[PDB]
Amino acid sequence: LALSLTADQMVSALLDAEPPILYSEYDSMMGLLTNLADRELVHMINWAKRVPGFVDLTLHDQVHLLESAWLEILMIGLVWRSMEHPGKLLFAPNLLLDRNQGKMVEIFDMLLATSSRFRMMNLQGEEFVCLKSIILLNSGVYEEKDHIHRVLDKITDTLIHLMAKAGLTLQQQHQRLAQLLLILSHIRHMSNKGMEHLYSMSDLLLEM
Amino acid sequence: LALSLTADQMVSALLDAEPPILYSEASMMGLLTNLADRELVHMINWAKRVPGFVDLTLHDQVHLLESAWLEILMIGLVWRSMEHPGKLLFAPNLLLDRNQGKEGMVEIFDMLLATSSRFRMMNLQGEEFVCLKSIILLNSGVYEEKDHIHRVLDKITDTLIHLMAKAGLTLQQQHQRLAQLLLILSHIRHMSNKGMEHLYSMLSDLLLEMLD
Ligand SMILES: C[C@H]1CCN(CCOc2ccc([C@@H]3c4ccc(O)cc4CC[C@@H]3c3ccccc3)cc2)C1
Ligand SMILES: C[C@H]1CCN(CCOc2ccc([C@@H]3c4ccc(O)cc4CC[C@@H]3c3ccccc3)cc2)C1
């Protein structure tokens, strides 16, 4: 029944679905980020459940979707809040790191670049939550399958609706749509590069 | 001077630019490498006939091909594999199913097969296909020169939209399908990444000499 949402209801539903911005433990850099990510993962699951259409999926469908998307969700979230701090990544309000402290400057330079990209594009928060939802439903998808594609189509409708209300021309609307979606493919890329470094060292999702 | 180009002529240019289909020559990893290596040459010549590409500095052209070359091979493979369900047409004389796919390679195979199915379900057209392939070339390595590329990318999106509108898809159906196509590109990024991993655990000089 979640496919009956109007575009504005979809946005409002996504905005209040938003997870908090966590802080880093006050009182060895990888640990701080690992600790942060672990705590971040917990609200991400309660977030995903509030994504329209998500809970309709069988629970092992939900688990496959989250296992594929989670690092991308983390990455776009980080990049999102890092937007208004050029040359730096805001992992937490008390943990704002620069280029030099990165040394993973391979992945960080990528993360910074994406942040610059969102900034030049002047990405709005309303567009942001759509993109994050898109990532959840799309990264893992390669009755159940088509429902997902129907949900994805609704988010597309919503994104366009946002751009029309913003006063962008029809041409500008599908161009901006194209630009944002291509950016997702470089978030996929980052996740992957992030993943293999992440094993230069899967089931709590059902439990959660 | 390639941006001064109507959507129809744009599709024309890309279509005629299409590379030929090549024939097949760890028996198999030696077969796919020879084929891919041969396929790689025609890709350079294809890339140069892609609108906006030769206006780029040579250093950037190499960089784009370095980032994208595997993605190009994969989507092309996926493309000609459409009408052959459950199989991969690496070549007219080399048609494989996933059984023959079996080290580390069956997972990549299955990914390529799903992509092929998705194109089949969506019923991807040739006009659209060549548009996507261009987007990959210019998008994959995108991270005066770095906005020219974004103009071309916008021009190709117009072209895609142009095609869906002519087809009779409504404005809503148009942007829905545009999105459906571009999201598939992120799967192809993923396949390429896992592909690079799988190849290291077993190009520039060519690209530079190749782009004589
Ligand atoms: C999925 C859980 C399994 C146990 N945990 C492993 C650590 O997971 C991460 C994921 C991301 C990071 C870094 C980070 C942390 C918080 C955040 O909001 C965003 C990011 C962006 C990725 C970043 C990173 C990138 C590449 C290698 C390591 C860490 C660190 C650890 C997380
Ligand atoms: C950069 C060039 C110089 C070194 N060469 C290494 C060979 O790279 C490849 C690329 C693709 C493949 C397989 C293939 C062959 C032909 C084709 O038209 C498409 C593809 C898609 C990928 C496929 C592959 C890629 C990676 C691991 C296993 C299989 C195999 C070897 C390529």
Numbering used by the authors:
A (entry chain C): 306 to 332, 341 to 416, 421 to 459, 470 to 528, 537 to 543
B (entry chain B): 306 to 330, 340 to 416, 419 to 459, 470 to 528, 536 to 545
Article, verbatim:
The pro-oncogenic cellular activities of estrogen receptor alpha (ERα) drive breast cancer pathogenesis. Activating somatic mutations near ERα helix 12, Y537S and D538G, enable hormone therapy resistance in metastatic ER +breast cancers.
LA-3 possesses a 3 R methylpyrrolidine (similar to OP1074) and showed a SERD-like profile with an IC50 of 26.94 ± 0.4 nM and maximum normalized fluorescence of 0.48 ± 0.07 at 5 μM. LA3-2 and LA5-2 are subsequently referred to as LA-Deg and LA-Stab for Laso degrader and stabilizer respectively.
